[PDB]
Each structure stands twice: as structure tokens, then as C-alpha cells.
Amino acid sequence: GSSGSSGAEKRIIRVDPTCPLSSNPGTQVYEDYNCTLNQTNIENNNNKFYIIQLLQDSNRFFTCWNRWGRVGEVGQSKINHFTRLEDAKKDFEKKFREKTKNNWAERDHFVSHPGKYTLIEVQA
């Protein structure tokens, strides 16, 4: 394990703040499984945001952090703990694709449907 290899730009992820584990030391965002989804509607300026990140503890246990609410505010907060890795992934992809009607792998041809959830990259 040494010497340079594979250029590209290494991306960095930061455990969502609203999430409790965030404070806990060691809790990091499993891989780069972090995508933000938006949802706007022509109704009393009502907007919502869906976040799906995959966390992993030092106890070989993953946790699916799901947060939703109203675009702009904190909103609600939901968390799920999964013993198996794949199990968690299935939920991360299933849900995502279920909201974006697209495949995480084929994100290249991400088709944005009218009314459904969109795919954003947030702003630092």
C-alpha cells in the first residue's frame, strides 16, 4: 500500500448533520452513496427534499439514514439499521430508483420525469 495510482479526483463525503451518528466518532458515509432528491409542486409553493445516505459503523452494521420534510426546513428524520450490507444497498437503490424511476448504475441516462423526484448535487 504505497506509491501513487489511479489519478481521478477522490471525492469526500460528510455524514449528514441532522443525523445523530454524525457526532459519533468513526461513523462515516459508506462509499459515495450520497444523493439529494428534490420535489416541487404548483401548490401553495410546497416543496420537499428526500435524502438517502448509507452509513457504516465499526460494528459491521450499516444504517440507512432517511430524512424528508419541506424544502428549506429540517423536516422529519428516519433511520434504519441493517445487519447485512447487501440488504441495506437493496433499500438504497430500490428507494432511489423508486423515486427517480431510474437505475443508480445507469445514472448516466438519468431521465427527469415531470412530478417525480429530481437528482441534484447540492451546493457547498
Residue whose entry in the numeric block shows the C-alpha cell 426546513: 73
In whole angstroms, give the CA distance from residue 95 to residue 100: 8
The string of DSSP letters for 98-122 reads HHHSS-STTGGG----SSS-EEE--
In this structure, which long-range contacts are made by residues 33-36, counting pairs with CB atoms below 8 Å and at least 24 apart in sequence? 33/92, 35/96, 35/119, 36/119, 36/120, 36/121, 36/122
Q: From CA 59, how far away is CA 18, in angstroms rounded? A: 22
Backbone dihedral region of 80: left (phi > 0), alpha (psi from -120 to 50 degrees) or beta? beta
Residue 83 amino acid letter: T
Neighbouring CB atoms inside 10 A of 90's CB total 12
Pick the closest to residue 92 from 68, 120, 64 (CA basis). Answer: 64
Element at 95 (helix H, strand E): helix 85-100
Method by which the model was determined: NMR
- Domains of the chain, by residue range, sit at 17-124
